[PDB]
Amino acid sequence: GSAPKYIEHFSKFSPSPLSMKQFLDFGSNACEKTSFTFLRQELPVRLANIMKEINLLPDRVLSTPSVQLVQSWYVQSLLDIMEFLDKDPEDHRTLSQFTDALVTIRNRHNDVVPTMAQGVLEYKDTYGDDPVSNQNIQYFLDRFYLSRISIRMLINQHTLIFDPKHIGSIDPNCNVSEVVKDAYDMAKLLCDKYYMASPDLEIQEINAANSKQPIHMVYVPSHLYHMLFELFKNAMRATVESHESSLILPPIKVMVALGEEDLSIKMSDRGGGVPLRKIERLFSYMYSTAPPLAGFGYGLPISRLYAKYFQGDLQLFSMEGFGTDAVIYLKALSTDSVERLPVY
Ligand SMILES: CN(Cc1ccc2nccnc2c1)C(=O)c1ccc(N(Cc2ccccc2)C(=O)c2ccc(O)cc2O)cc1
Ligand SMILES: CC(C)c1ccc(COc2ccc(CC(=O)NCCN)cc2Cl)cc1
Ligand SMILES: [Cl-]
Ligand SMILES: [Cl-]
Ligand SMILES: [Cl-]
């Protein structure tokens, strides 16, 4: 077949990062034809760029069942999208069977994450868990997952618009605190269920420019929830477990600061912290892979990719003996929120 040729062709192109503006302008609808003509080019670009990177992996990794699996998915998905390169954007069936095609692709790729996890696992027992294996896994998975996040963003934007207020997965009016409370309510629910004690939540807002206004932004709230949800899980585990032979359960304090470009979200706990040495391993896919509420692999690094994805970040610093702070940094301004795609 043609796969390695297509890979070859489209991996000469560079994925085109979009900004929230451009994202918003894509269904504000009837320029679905325009989403179609765009996506039939750009998915193959993006699919191919990562596919080529998968190929640069040494044979001992690439030859493993897990990788060969997801690689087979990427090939089929690229083929699936190929069928439409000739097709004409004015035939309303051309269009609606592209949607199906995108939907089907998105389901095909669902289990990528625990699949790669299995490859890491096999690799760990099969070749060792040395620092250098670890930089390498990290390097590849941070890019891959990031790649994949951006592919999904594209598919979801398309399928959700072409079945106001919300534009696909973008809320142009996301109330950050609203999303915080939700993630907290849900983490508490699970925290209550497994621990039978859950810390309270305290939120403070700091709108620097407008003392009064509630903090709203343009974002992808499911993205934000995911990140918050994961940080809640962790801060809850730590809070509860560090205090089981003690009466008070200190609340989890979250602050939302809106600056001139940063919108920053800090989740501070009193869980007794982590010493500085063990902080880098928390983001390591490898060290957080192994054969409840947490101990539950990948949430941190993936949450951090989520933040990186529109030029944000996610950092942890801890005080051993006291607790951990966790900061999600996001762009305040739609203008500054541009996709961040792995290089190639
Ligand atoms: C428990 N998980 C999930 C996880 C997932 C895969 C793993 N894989 C291997 C080992 N541990 C894993 C843990 C955590 O990441 C996690 C790690 C460290 C903390 N701890 C330390 C701690 C304190 C008391 C009791 C237990 C732990 C933290 O300080 C901490 C870390 C991140 C965070 O957002 C908040 C925190 O409070 C809290 C949570
Ligand atoms: C399953 C997926 C996540 C996975 C699992 C495991 C890995 C591991 O990847 C490694 C490990 C060691 C080396 C050293 C090497 O060969 N150096 C060459 C010397 N110049 C290179 C790579 Cl790409 C990647 C991806
Ligand atoms: Cl990255
Ligand atoms: Cl789109
Ligand atoms: Cl850090």
Side-chain angles (χ1 to χ4, degrees), residues 1-28 30-211 213-344:
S2 266
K5 180 186 183 183
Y6 294 155
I7 285 160
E8 175 48 27
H9 172 58
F10 291 113
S11 75
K12 290 209 120 53
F13 290 75
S14 265
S16 299
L18 307 183
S19 77
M20 294 281 192
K21 175 165 67 217
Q22 322 185 231
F23 268 128
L24 293 161
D25 295 335
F26 252 125
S28 49
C31 41
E32 173 183 356
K33 306 106 99 297
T34 313
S35 180
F36 175 73
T37 71
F38 173 81
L39 283 183
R40 62 171 185 189
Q41 189 63 15
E42 184 73 10
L43 294 177
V45 174
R46 282 173 194 208
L47 291 172
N49 274 267
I50 201 57
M51 289 179 81
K52 194 153 181 166
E53 191 150 333
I54 295 147
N55 281 7
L56 286 221
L57 288 157
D59 196 62
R60 66 184 181 291
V61 170
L62 189 71
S63 83
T64 55
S66 50
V67 182
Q68 285 287 89
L69 181 59
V70 345
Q71 182 117 257
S72 82
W73 295 339
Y74 276 74
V75 175
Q76 190 54 62
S77 291
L78 181 56
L79 296 181
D80 283 20
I81 285 146
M82 290 316 195
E83 298 295 79
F84 300 92
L85 291 154
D86 59 281
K87 260 71 183 164
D88 142 62
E90 313 272 39
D91 178 16
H92 305 294
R93 256 176 323 122
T94 268
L95 283 180
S96 101
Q97 85 208 339
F98 184 62
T99 279
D100 289 47
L102 295 196
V103 166
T104 288
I105 287 167
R106 203 200 28 239
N107 307 330
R108 185 153 47 236
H109 291 234
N110 273 323
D111 309 323
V112 276
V113 172
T115 306
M116 291 293 182
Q118 228 356 87
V120 182
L121 197 57
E122 142 179 20
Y123 186 97
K124 267 179 74 183
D125 307 314
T126 262
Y127 296 104
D129 54 357
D130 50 286
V132 186
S133 286
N134 186 72
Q135 281 139 59
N136 267 87
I137 289 162
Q138 206 59 19
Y139 177 89
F140 173 76
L141 283 177
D142 269 337
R143 296 157 54 84
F144 172 74
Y145 286 142
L146 189 49
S147 155
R148 187 229 180 194
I149 283 161
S150 67
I151 291 165
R152 271 178 124 64
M153 181 69 194
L154 291 189
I155 276 100
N156 291 340
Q157 282 301 281
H158 197 76
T159 64
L160 288 167
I161 300 164
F162 319 108
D163 37 32
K165 266 186 266 172
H166 272 248
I167 310 290
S169 66
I170 302 158
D171 190 345
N173 252 302
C174 188
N175 177 276
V176 173
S177 283
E178 174 47 359
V179 180
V180 169
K181 294 159 181 161
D182 295 6
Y184 164 82
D185 290 343
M186 188 71 244
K188 182 192 175 123
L189 213 149
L190 304 176
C191 184
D192 278 346
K193 196 64 77 170
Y194 171 80
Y195 284 121
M196 287 99 107
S198 59
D200 295 8
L201 161 63
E202 259 179 58
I203 294 168
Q204 193 190 187
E205 286 212 351
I206 303 291
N207 185 337
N210 304 106
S211 210
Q213 283 179 41
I215 296 155
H216 293 116
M217 73 187 302
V218 184
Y219 208 61
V220 186
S222 59
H223 284 2
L224 187 57
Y225 180 95
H226 194 126
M227 304 184 275
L228 282 160
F229 185 56
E230 283 280 345
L231 290 165
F232 285 127
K233 251 103 68 67
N234 293 337
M236 284 176 187
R237 165 148 103 116
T239 306
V240 167
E241 294 196 7
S242 74
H243 276 70
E244 34 200 35
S245 332
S246 150
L247 288 160
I248 74 300
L249 217 67
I252 288 168
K253 291 162 195 169
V254 170
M255 155 146 58
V256 184
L258 169 58
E260 292 292 308
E261 57 187 87
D262 289 357
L263 192 175
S264 308
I265 310 167
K266 176 178 271 190
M267 175 182 308
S268 313
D269 66 64
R270 275 169 161 72
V274 189
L276 179 59
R277 197 163 47 87
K278 296 169 167 184
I279 271 287
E280 68 114 45
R281 32 230 297 123
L282 292 167
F283 278 111
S284 148
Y285 300 97
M286 198 192 78
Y287 294 120
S288 78
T289 316
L293 201 258
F296 234 71
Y298 295 6
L300 276 177
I302 284 165
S303 292
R304 179 209 242 175
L305 303 178
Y306 275 111
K308 273 168 170 167
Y309 177 45
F310 288 98
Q311 321 293 324
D313 195 3
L314 186 171
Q315 314 180 348
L316 292 194
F317 33 91
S318 206
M319 314 274 274
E320 191 196 22
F322 173 85
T324 301
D325 284 356
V327 195
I328 299 179
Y329 295 93
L330 310 183
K331 286 312 197 195
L333 302 168
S334 47
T335 19
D336 295 342
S337 292
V338 173
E339 281 191 323
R340 152 110 92 104
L341 307 182
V343 187
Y344 324 115

